[PDB]
Amino acid sequence: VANEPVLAFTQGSPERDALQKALKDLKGRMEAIPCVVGDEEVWTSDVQYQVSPFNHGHKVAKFCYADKSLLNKAIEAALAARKEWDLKPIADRAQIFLKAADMLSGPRRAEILAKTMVGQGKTVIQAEIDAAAELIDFFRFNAKYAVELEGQQPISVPPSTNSTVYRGLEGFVAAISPFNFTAIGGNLAGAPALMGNVVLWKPSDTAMLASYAVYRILREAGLPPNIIQFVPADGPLFGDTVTSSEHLCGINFTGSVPTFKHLWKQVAQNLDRFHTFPRLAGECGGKNFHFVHRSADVESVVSGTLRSAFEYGGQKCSACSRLYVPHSLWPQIKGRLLEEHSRIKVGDPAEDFGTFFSAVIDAKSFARIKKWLEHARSSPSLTILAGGKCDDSVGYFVEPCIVESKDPQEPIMKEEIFGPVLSVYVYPDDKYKETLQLVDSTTSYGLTGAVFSQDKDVVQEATKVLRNAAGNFYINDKSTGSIVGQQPFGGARASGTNDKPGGPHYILRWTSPQVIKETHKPLGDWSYAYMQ
Amino acid sequence: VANEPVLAFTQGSPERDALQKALKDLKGRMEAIPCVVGDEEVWTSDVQYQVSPFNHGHKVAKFCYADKSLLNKAIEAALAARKEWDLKPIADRAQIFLKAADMLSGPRRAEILAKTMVGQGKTVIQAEIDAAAELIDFFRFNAKYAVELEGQQPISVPPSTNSTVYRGLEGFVAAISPFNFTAIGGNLAGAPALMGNVVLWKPSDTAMLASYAVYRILREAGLPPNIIQFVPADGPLFGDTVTSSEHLCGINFTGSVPTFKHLWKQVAQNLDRFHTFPRLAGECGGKNFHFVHRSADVESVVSGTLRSAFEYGGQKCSACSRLYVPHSLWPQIKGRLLEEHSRIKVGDPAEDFGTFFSAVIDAKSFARIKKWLEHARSSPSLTILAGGKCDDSVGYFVEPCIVESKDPQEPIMKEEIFGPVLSVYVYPDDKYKETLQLVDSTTSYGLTGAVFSQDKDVVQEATKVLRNAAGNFYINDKSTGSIVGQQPFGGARASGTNDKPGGPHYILRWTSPQVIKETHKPLGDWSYAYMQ
Ligand SMILES: O=P(O)(O)Oc1c2c(c(O)c3c1[C@H]1C[C@@H]3c3cc4c(cc31)[C@H]1C[C@@H]4c3ccccc31)[C@H]1C[C@@H]2c2cc3c(cc21)[C@H]1C[C@@H]3c2ccccc21
C-alpha cells in the first residue's frame, strides 16, 4: 500500500472541473441527515442545522440529536451485532474499508471535498489532504496493519500448538470526532470497527454534511448494519449516556483537554458497573512551536510558519501558535512575515480558489478568538504587528493576526486559541540554549514543534532538549501536515494518550487478544518425578 | 532467544543438592531488608516481619514501610535519573536484564528458589517455574521484543527522513507486585525500566525475601541507581502517595480487582494535576473453568484439574476453581478425583520434597478460605466431597477441598477464593450446549479456561462460544502454567486490562513514541499553484 497521491487541481484539470461541479451542486441545497441505527433512519424532535462557516445564512444540513432513549437503543442493537462481526475474518472486514478507500479516491472524491469545503470552510487543498488523502490513507494503512498483525504469533513447542486470536473489545466503543478533519471521524469510528468492534459515532455538529457522507460510503462499501451507529447528540448527554452503560469498552476521542478529562472522570466514577475496563484514547490539542536558530533558511521559516499558523485558520491541534526568533534575524523575518501577510487572501473558498483560508468554524469559536484579539490590544506585553480585525456579518471571518509578546510566559504563549493567531517571542541570540529550555517549559502541551537550523550541532542539541516537548518533531519543516505511515501522529503531556494513529501500533488499542494452547498428547500424572 | 530449561530436581541431580544447600542456608536465619533509594539503605521505625507460611513462628525477614517523606524522596531521585536512563540505547538497557537472567539461570538459581520456597511457601517445582524460568524468560523475551521494536520505523519519502524514537514515559511508574509469583515483581518493575522508565517498586510483604533478591540481582547486573527504588510500604499509603504526585505516568499492578479499581479512581480524582495521562495496567483475578465433554480423556481431566486447582494451594489467578462434568462421566471422574485426593501430601516443602503443596500465604488468606469452607458445609446446594479442614497451629495449612454444587450460579461458582477449593457442577450430557453458555455467563471474570474433548467439532464449537470467557484458553490442557513467548498471559471482563505480558506488545504500554521528520531541501512558497 502507498499513500494516496495529492492532486494539484490545476486550471483545466479533471479534478478541478469535478470539484467545481460538486460545489455548484451544494450551493443553495440542504440535506436532511437522520440518526442511523442499523438501517433505520430515525428523527427526534431536537432538530439542528449546520451552516456554511463563510456564509452562515446558508443551511447546508438539517439533523437531529439522539436522546438517552435512542442512544440506549443504538447500544443494544450494536451489541447484538458484535459477536458476528468480531468473528468475521479480518481480511473480510478490511475489504469493506479498502472498497470505501477506492470510492473516496475516485467517484466520491469531488463530493467529499466539496462537502468538507462548504460545511467546514476548508479550501481546496485543505479538503484534499483531509477528506481524500488522509481518510483514504487511514483506511488502507490500518487495513494493512490489521492483516499483518494476524502474523504476529507465539512460539509452539511439542506437545502443544499456540495461537493468538485478535478479538475485538467486548462491549461498544464511543467515537467522538471533531469539526476540523473529516478524516479523523472516519478513523475514530473506522479503526475500532475494522478491529471487530461496534461503535456509536457522535460526529461534530459543524462537520455533519461531510461526516454523513463518510458514513454512507462505508455502508455502500458493505459495512453491515449496527456496526457503526450514526448518532449526533448533545455532547454532555452523549457522554453521560455512554459512560453510564455497563457495556462501554472504549472511548475514541479527539477534541478539548477538559472534555476528555471529564469523560475519564465519568468512567472512573462508574467503574464498578462496567463488565470490563474501558479503554480511553484521547487526542487533546497543542500549543505548538516553531523555534528558529540564527543559521535558519529564512524563506523556509517564513513559508512554513505562515502555512502552519494560518492554514485552515489555524484550526489544527498541530498549528504553530508560538514562534521563537533570534534578535539578529528578527528585522529580516518580521519584514518578510509582514510582506507576505498583506498577500494572504481570506474569503469564500468555494467561489474564490485564490483564498488562502476562510472563516473559522462557528460563532462560539469566533467569540473566543475575538476575546484573544481584544487581549492582544489590552495587554502591556503584546503588540499586534499584522491583522487584528474580525467580521461576523456574512461568515465567521478573522484576519490572520501576528502578535509580538515581550513576555515568553504571557497567556497568549500558553493557551490554545484554535484560530489564526501567531505569537512571536524574540530571544537574544547568545541565549538560544536558555530559550530551548523556555520552549520546553512554557506550556502544558507536548504535540508538535519544529526547529529551523542549518547548524547541525544546534539541531542535535534542540532534538535532545525538546524530546518531550513534541511527539511530532520537525527539523526544517512546518509543524502541521503529518502523513499516515510517514509521521504517526500524537503527543503526551496534556496533548492526550499518544496512541499514534497513522502508525502500526494504533490498532492494538482496539484488540484484546486471546491465546489458545492446544495439547496433542495425554497429560500423564499430577505428581512430579522429584517428589518420588 | 529460547525459553529457560525447566530442571527436574531428581535425586542425585546437581540442582537438587544446590537447592537443599540454599534451603539449609536460610533455616533459622533472618535478613534485615531496607528500603533502597538510589544506593542508600533507609530504615523507618515502621518495622515489619515476613514469616514462613508453613512455619509462621520462623521470621525469614525484617523490613520496614516507607513513609510519605521517603516515598516523595524516592520519586524526586528517580525523576532526576530518568532523562539519562531514557537516552541510554535500548541495547545497553537490555544487556543489564540479560546479565540478570544469566545470574538467575546459573549461580543465583538455588538462592532465588529457596527464598521463594521459605518465604512464599512454594514447592520446588513451583519455585522453579516462577523465580527461575518465568523471570528469566520475562527478562530475555522482553529484551528481544524491545530491540525488535526499535526496527519498527516509518516510511521516508524525499525530500524528508522520518524516524520513531521509542521514548520512555515522562514521569515515574509505580509497580505494585503480588505475593504469589516472584517473577511478576521482576516483570512489573523490570519491563517499564527496560523501556526507559524509572520505577517505585512496592513489593508484596509476604514475598519480601525473594523480591529483594531480585532487586539485588538487577543492581549487581548493572542497573544504575534511582532507576528502580525498592520501597515496601502500606498499600493504601503507597497508592495515596503515588496518585497524589503530579509526576505519576503509570501504574503496573497485579492483585485484587478492588485495589486496582481504587487506584484507577484515585488517578481520575487527581487527573487535573498530572503533567500527562497516567497509564494503568492491571492483572487481577479469575474464576477459571475446566469444561469436560463426554469424549474427554478422563485421566488428563483428573491430573490437569488436580494440578490447576491445587498447585501452590490454588493461589493463582489462573487456577481452576470450577469444573463442569457431564453426568455420564461423573461416577468415573468423582471416583478418580477422590482416590487421588487421598494421595496428596500437604506439608513443609523445604523439609519434605514429597509435598504436593504447602500452607497458604498468610492469616488473612487462611481466614477467607476457612470462611468459604464454612459456606461449603452450610449451604443448601453444596456438599463437601473431600477435604474441608484447616489448621493454623504451625502454618496456614488448608487441605485440598472438592465441593459439589447443584446450583451452577452458587456464590462458590462465582467468587475467587485464592485457595485450594475446587467447585464441581455436574450437567446432563444432552445439555452440553446450554452448559457451554453457563460457563460463559456465570462469573464476572475472563482469565483462563480449558475444554477437555477428543471430539474436534465440540472443540471448535466451545472455542467460539467461550471466545470472551478466557483470554488464555486451553484445549486438552490445564488452565495454569502459561509460558512466556508461548502463551502471552491475560484476560478481560473483570480480570484486568489484558496487556498480555509474555508477548511482544506488552512493552508498548511503557513507551510514548516521538516521530521526527527532517526535511533536507528548502520549503518554497506558502501559496499553492492552484490558487494562482
Ligand atoms: O457475612 P458476615 O461477614 O457478616 O458473617 C460471617 C459469616 C461466616 C463466617 O465464617 C464469618 C462471618 C464473620 C465472622 C466470620 C468472619 C470471617 C471474616 C470476616 C467476617 C466474618 C471478615 C474477616 C474474615 C473475612 C474473610 C473474607 C471477607 C471478610 C472477612 C459464614 C456465615 C457468614 C458467611 C458469609 C459468607 C460466607 C461464609 C459465611 C462465604 C459466602 C459469604 C462470603 C463472603 C466473603 C467470603 C466468603 C463468604
Author numbering:
A (entry chain B), B (entry chain A): 32 to 563
What does the paper say about this structure?
The aromatic ring system of these compounds is able to include lysine and arginine side chains, supported by one or two phosphate groups that are attached to the half-moon-shaped molecule. Furthermore, we solved crystal structures of two different tweezer variants in complex with the enzyme Δ1-Pyrroline-5-carboxyl-dehydrogenase (P5CDH) and found that the tweezers are bound to a lysine and methionine side chain, respectively. Therefore, P5CDH was chosen as a target for the systematic analysis of co-crystallization with two different tweezer molecules, the diphosphate tweezer CLR01, which was also used for the 14-3-3 structures, and a monophosphate tweezer, where one phosphate group is replaced by a sterically less-demanding hydroxyl group. In both crystals, only one tweezer molecule is seen in the asymmetric unit despite the presence of two and four monomers of P5CDH, respectively, revealing an asymmetric binding mode of the tweezer to P5CDH, depending on the non-equivalent environment of the tweezer binding sites in the monomers.
